[PDB]
Amino acid sequence: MLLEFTKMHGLGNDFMVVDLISQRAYLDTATIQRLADRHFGVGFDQLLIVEPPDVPEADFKYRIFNADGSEVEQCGNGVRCFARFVHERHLTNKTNITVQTKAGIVKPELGQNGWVRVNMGYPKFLPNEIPFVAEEPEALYTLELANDQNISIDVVNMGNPHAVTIVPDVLTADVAGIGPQVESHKRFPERVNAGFMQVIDDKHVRLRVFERGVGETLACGTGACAAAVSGMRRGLLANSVEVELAGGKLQIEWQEGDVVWMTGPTTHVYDGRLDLRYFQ
Ligand SMILES: [Cl-]
């Protein structure tokens, strides 16, 4: 009668996580919106449901929905919460899980104290792969803003589009004024996640991200990937980098020609139970 769930977050990107292997529930778009509501519902950035696999080689399937009920994720943190969750719920004893997702097979690696290592795929850089309006691929690009202000950006696609600019001080960066101008720039026809990176040294950076359609967020994981990859391409960063997001720290590893590896934390906040009827 009652749906059990777990509230989790990854550096403040917060999830409602539901075992739909030992449970069954009908969750349409409106029900997800009602559950997501911070005042009337559970309150979450995304909903993650664990489901029986469709293919014999997967241990699990999952799907991730936004607060408005659409099946979308911008930052790629949910995979880490998933890997922790199936362990915490005793759904498996394996720490190298094979999971079927909307992007194919993923094999997250759960380690110590809730940290999870994730294959984030290959970065893409060509303008038409971002998408970004530019005649030729370059190392950096000048982007024109309002009132004759310009910034230098690098572009990366991690499945979603990113533009990374380097600032001397992440605390004083004009994210509120510059972010919207980048995120909706005419040169980004599908909009873009705008990252503002301060380089502390070759192994440590700080990063604020103005996310597409959202604004500044605590923990854009693909944005951390894009910033670290960009700093490596510019010859500023080593091939393993701690990125301090607004929500906390995680690690990015990359070498040109290989995939990006992200190792990030997870947090178990509380276990809950609710009567789904009051939300359907
Ligand atoms: Cl421009």
From Swiss-Prot:
Swiss-Prot/TrEMBL site (Important for dimerization) positions: Y270
Site (Could be important to modulate the pK values of the two catalytic cysteine residues): H162, E211
Species for this entry: Acinetobacter baumannii (strain AB307-0294)
Catalytic activity, EC: 5.1.1.7
Alphabetized InterPro entries for the sequence: DAP_epimerase_AS, DAP_epimerase_DapF
Gene name per UniProt: dapF
BP-aspect Gene Ontology terms: lysine biosynthetic process via diaminopimelate
Protein name: Diaminopimelate epimerase
Catalytic residues as annotated in Swiss-Prot or TrEMBL: C75, C220
Keyword Ribosomal protein included in the entry's annotation: no
Function according to Swiss-Prot or TrEMBL: Catalyzes the stereoinversion of LL-2,6-diaminopimelate (L,L-DAP) to meso-diaminopimelate (meso-DAP), a precursor of L-lysine and an essential component of the bacterial peptidoglycan.
Protein's pathway: Amino-acid biosynthesis; L-lysine biosynthesis via DAP pathway; DL-2,6-diaminopimelate from LL-2,6-diaminopimelate: step 1/1
Known partners and oligomeric status: Homodimer.
Catalytic reactions of this protein: (2S,6S)-2,6-diaminopimelate = meso-2,6-diaminopimelate
